[PDB]
Design a protein around this ligand. Structure first.
Ligand code: DAO
Length: 389
């Protein structure tokens, strides 16, 4: 059951209030990842507060549960900041004071919800993480001057673009790792993400898992550091889907893995290492397609997007997709060291000239926010903008 019914009522009845931290990109340019924050206000100038309750598992990572909708909170942030900036890329969190870390706000659903997708729940790695490893690392990994507030990019990741296009709240369980290295590998596992999603949603009011759109992508971390073999990663992926569908999940956005060996990171790897990872990716992608077919045959709503085929096109012919460069990071990083994520980096001259929206890669591994937007747009086109869901 994860949390007893008694524990749930006791936590839900422990009613209180908290404040809202409104984050925003300080520059009008997506070349600058730097952010700042302001407390949300009401139109009369008074502090905006939200009512609800706190809950943390043995993780001690506190989530605030409110009846106030994500749209109302976003609206308060937008009006408070009054930034005539198209690239403000506003995000928000619960915080009692300046000492507080960035707590996720869960907006409780109404008892009478229509049978329709009303939220996005993301699971995965640094292709989806919006702040979990950042929060875990105490706002250090990745550096907030060169990576957009805990996202491994210069802005929003594909899940945020998918959720925004559909005007849906996004709740993130994805956790960034370290490409080609062993840092955080016992903490980033999809098993722990599914367990966490199953524990925290038990505290939500009127939660109907049938109304959640689940996104899932992982396996590249394990293939890059040799932590889990192809069959071990296939088993982990199959387990995540078994556990989620057994817990009432009905809707999934699945994707094949892009060939990470096409990223700037692998300029510094040996050909032997590259061919090994490429082969694991190809093997995993056939399994992902088989899993999508398996759940579709059982009557689940599955949208499978071939991200692998898209990144093959993006890296071989960037000019056909609106990019000038798919071979270098936009940031002036010329090695593959996890240590670089702790520091500030200038843009390399070619990226300063063209703008970050014309580069496929932000750093040696991760796509820029323009690439994330393109992937989101291509996925939304393949799924005919909520067709099966
Ligand atoms: C060709 C583009 C490839 C994009 C690779 C994205 C990085 C995958 C995530 C692996 C690191 C991690 O987050 O644990």
């Amino acid at each position: 059951a994860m949390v007893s019914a008694a524990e749930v009522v006791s936590a839900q009845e422990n009613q209180t209030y908290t404040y809202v931290r409104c984050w925003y990109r300080t520059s009008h340019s997506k070349d600058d990842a730097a952010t700042d924050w302001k407390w949300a206000k009401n139109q009369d100038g008074s502090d905006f507060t939200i009512d609800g309750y706190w809950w943390s598992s043995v993780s001690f990572k506190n989530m605030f549960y409110t009846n106030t909708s994500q749209n109302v909170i976003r609206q308060r942030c937008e009006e408070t900041l009054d930034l005539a900036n198209e690239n403000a890329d506003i995000t928000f969190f619960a915080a009692d004071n300046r000492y507080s870390y960035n707590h996720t706000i869960w907006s409780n659903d109404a008892a009478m919800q229509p049978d329709q997708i009303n939220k996005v729940v993301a699971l995965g790695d640094s292709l989806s993480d919006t702040g979990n490893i950042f929060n875990a690392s105490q706002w250090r990994f990745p550096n907030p001057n060169s990576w957009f507030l805990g996202h491994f990019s210069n802005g929003f990741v594909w899940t945020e673009y998918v959720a925004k296009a559909k005007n849906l709240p996004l709740y993130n369980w994805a956790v960034g790792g370290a490409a080609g290295e062993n840092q955080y590998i016992a903490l980033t596992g999809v098993g722990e993400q599914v367990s966490s999603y199953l524990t925290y949603t038990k505290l939500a009011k009127n939660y109907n898992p049938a109304n959640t759109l689940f996104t899932l992508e992982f396996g590249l971390n394990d293939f890059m550091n040799y932590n889990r073999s192809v069959p071990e990663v296939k088993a982990d992926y199959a387990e995540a889907l078994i556990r989620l569908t057994d817990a009432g999940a009905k809707n999934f956005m699945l994707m094949t893995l892009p060939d990470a060996t096409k990223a700037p990171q692998f300029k510094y790897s040996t050909q032997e290492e590259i061919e090994t990872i490429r082969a694991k990716v190809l093997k995993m992608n056939e399994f992902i397609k088989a899993q999508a077919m398996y759940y579709k045959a059982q009557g689940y709503n599955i949208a499978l997007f071939d991200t692998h085929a898209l990144f093959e096109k993006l890296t071989s012919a960037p000019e056909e997709h609106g990019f000038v460069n798919a071979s270098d990071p936009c940031l002036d990083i010329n090695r593959s060291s996890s240590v670089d994520y702790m520091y500030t980096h200038s843009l390399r001259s070619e990226c300063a000239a063209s703008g970050a929206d014309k580069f496929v890669f932000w750093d040696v591994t991760h796509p820029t926010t323009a690439t994330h937007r393109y992937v989101a747009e291509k996925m939304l086109e393949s799924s005919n903008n909520l067709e099966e869901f």
